Amino acid sequence: KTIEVTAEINCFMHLLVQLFLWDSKELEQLVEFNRKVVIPNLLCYYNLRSLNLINAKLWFYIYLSHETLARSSEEINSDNQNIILRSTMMKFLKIASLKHDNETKAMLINLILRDFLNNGEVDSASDFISKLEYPHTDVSSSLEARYFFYLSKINAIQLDYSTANEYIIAAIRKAPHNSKSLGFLQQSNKLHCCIQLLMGDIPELSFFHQSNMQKSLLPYYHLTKAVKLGDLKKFTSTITKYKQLLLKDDTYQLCVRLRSNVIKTGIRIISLTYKKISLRDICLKLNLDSEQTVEYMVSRAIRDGVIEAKINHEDGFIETTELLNIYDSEDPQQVFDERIKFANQLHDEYLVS
Amino acid sequence: YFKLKKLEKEYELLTLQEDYIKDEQRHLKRELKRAQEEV
């Protein structure tokens, strides 16, 4: 009877482990029974509790394949099935109240951000993300990394690159599993190269060179080169060739964001070092891009803050700064201040540890 | 529930004591410098 309760539970976990294509024959047919299994004498008990005996991951694996819409087949106004999942996951979400829930709770948020990333709208993300903070000391190294990956994706549409760079770089330094070195690793790399492109600071893909397929690399190089050399012409023809690629990965958003960046990168390489830079040169470069908006674009260029310049067109010179800092006041001290904060948090962990 | 009160009590004694650890620790810092100086 003690044994009976326990025996049901061990059986429920066991059925969940088996069904990743062993003694199985249709993940979707079986879903009904998996929902059935989950909720009595398991999901029910845990009301103020969280564990790694309850795991969204097992159910995630199951649910993910159905969302290729090949079992739905787009015969229908909306999926029922995803709505059901979402209803049920949100039902857990209530139960969590940030007292001991950070564990399983965090997976549900990964799932929720994924559905927005497939085809929803990513403005709803903001609250979940905030709710979802509370000291994290029970989430696994792979889980941290996936969450960051999804979070980074959110940030990028919202036009927040720096924040996304920090998270993706922090992600790849979790996960000693050899199972997240496989295709997942490739996806992660993709996103780190995209963020590098957006900032437009972009280094060469050297590091990536012995950790991706040479097939992946060459197109990936092609994009980076397009930005770096600073041609619109080069960039457009690279988009044209590797159309299937940018579509496939779903990082088609680049084509909007990057175009304005590419043209700016192209002025930047042309030097702005001395007290005046003659107007004719800068006009010449721009003339190739567009010669009806040479004043409008240079003005916009300055406004952005990427580069900064002064123009007289009653002298017809463009006046510029070095683009090199000074050390004589608070701004290097602010870097000193960030570093000491980082050290203290780290110190607190070593002592605790 | 008579049980819950009791358990809350046990925990409370414990709390006063967790602050108490800290207060002896602070004190020891002062005495450590003075001793090292003395030598």
Binding site: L48, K99, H100, L351, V352 | Y1, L4, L7, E8, Y11, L14, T15, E18, I21, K22, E24, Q25, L28, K29, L32
Partner: peptide, 28 residues
Amino acid sequence: EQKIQETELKIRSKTENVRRLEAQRNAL
């Protein structure tokens, strides 16, 4: 009742961090 259980739970969490400090206090 549920709220009373939660208050107790948070005390249990704080203690472990103290235990690691009970060790540090002894070294001093």
